[PDB]
Amino acid sequence: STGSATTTPIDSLDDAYITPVQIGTPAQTLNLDFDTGSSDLWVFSSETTASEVDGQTIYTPSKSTTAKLLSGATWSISYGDGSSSSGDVYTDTVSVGGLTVTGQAVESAKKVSSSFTEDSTIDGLLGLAFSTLNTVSPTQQKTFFDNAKASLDSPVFTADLGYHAPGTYNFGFIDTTAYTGSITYTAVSTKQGFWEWTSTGYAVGSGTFKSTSIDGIADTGTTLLYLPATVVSAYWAQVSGAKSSSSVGGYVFPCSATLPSFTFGVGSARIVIPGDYIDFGPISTGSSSCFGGIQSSAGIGINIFGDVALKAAFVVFNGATTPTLGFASK
Numbered sequence: 238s239t240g241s242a243t244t245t246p247i248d249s250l251d252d253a254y255i256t257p258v259q260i261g262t263p264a265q266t267l268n269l270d271f272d273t274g275s276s277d278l279w280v281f282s283s284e285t286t287a288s289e290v291d292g293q294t295i296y297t298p299s300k301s302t303t304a305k306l307l308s309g310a311t312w313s314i315s316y317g318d319g320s321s322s323s324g325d326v327y328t329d330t331v332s333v334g335g336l337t338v339t340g341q342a343v344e345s346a347k348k349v350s351s352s353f354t355e356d357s358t359i360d361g362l363l364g365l366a367f368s369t370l371n372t373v374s375p376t377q378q379k380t381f382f383d384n385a386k387a388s389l390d391s392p393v394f395t396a397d398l399g400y401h402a403p404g405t406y407n408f409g410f411i412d413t414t415a416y417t418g419s420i421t422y423t424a425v426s427t428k429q430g431f432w433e434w435t436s437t438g439y440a441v442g443s444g445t446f447k448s449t450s451i452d453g454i455a456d457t458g459t460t461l462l463y464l465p466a467t468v469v470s471a472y473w474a475q476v477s478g479a480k481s482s483s484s485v486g487g488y489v490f491p492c493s494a495t496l497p498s499f500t501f502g503v504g505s506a507r508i509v510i511p512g513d514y515i516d517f518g519p520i521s522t523g524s525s526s527c528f529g530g531i532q533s534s535a536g537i538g539i540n541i542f543g544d545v546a547l548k549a550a551f552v553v554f555n556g557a558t559t560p561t562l563g564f565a566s567k
């Protein structure tokens with residue numbers, strides 16, 4: 238089997254991407270944030286504290302003939318931006334782009350933090366990291382991809398995120414029309430439960446490539462590119478007037494600037510992020526200070542190849558017995 242679904246930016250800055258997912262019988266379609274940095278499929282629901290729902294579409298298990306309470310199971314998760322959610326668990330039929338999994342753990346939110354409430358366009362998350370990170374207790378549950386894997390034509394999914402435009406998540410096949418040149422594959426460590434790999438280095442603009450190992454995670458659920466302070470300083474030093482602002486929470490730059498590109502290495506191959514992808518617009522409405530899309534990972538404890546990086550590439554998440562990651566230009 239295979240599946241293919243369009244993923245759409247939630248706003249004009251590509252702050253996140255949502256993908257329609259069919260849950261239950263008859264189908265209830267919710268728009269979920271596919272997140273290769275976590276492993277829980279959770280949704281706004283009929284059980285979510287009413288004051289914490291503001292415009293989201295909810296899953297109502299009582300209206301699904303295939304929903305079953307997973308007795309005794311609870312979940313609770315916190316994300317890297319400080320947001321969180323928790324609740325109980327059902328199993329139900331879940332389909333993505335024509336690919337169906339029966340008995341998928343669908344984690345129903347009883348509580349969500351303020352930033353989720355404030356995000357009316359995101360109805361939940363669909364985790365695509367390794368199932369070892371799944372938070373369900375006392376019986377850990379599998380991700381959608383892990384449940385689907387055996388049935389897939391090939392044990393892979395791909396992320397093809399658009400810049401200010403829709404893109405695609407495919408399951409079970411590699412669309413050879415969706416990228417240019419060849420796909421370069423690179424080793425993955427699953428030791429921390431992430432799609433963790435090592436970039437071979439970077440360049441800023443038309444500058445020379447610096448060969449240096451940068452360990453980090455391919456994380457579709459993180460908006461920006463978070464890299465070591467040395468690398469980030471070298472980038473922003475090429476933008477007149479750019480500075481790190483503790484009050485804003487990162488590097489900002491004059492909105493009048495033309496940003497340089499940023500290149501990262503994948504083995505001997507190179508992925509180029511155009512300068513425009515690094516612009517996240519005014520820090521507040523009407524401001525001439527703009528927020529940067531490359532930020533320091535110092536304090537996070539891990540480097541994160543988020544959407545800013547991933548959207549410059551066609552990315553293969555290879556879930557073979559020994560997982561790997563593939564990157565191609567597009």
Ligand SMILES: NCc1ccc(C(F)(F)F)o1
Nearest residue numbers: 270272316320352353458
């Ligand atoms: N800040 C709430 C929110 C929306 C999307 C996300 C997540 F992907 F990082 F989990 O968190």
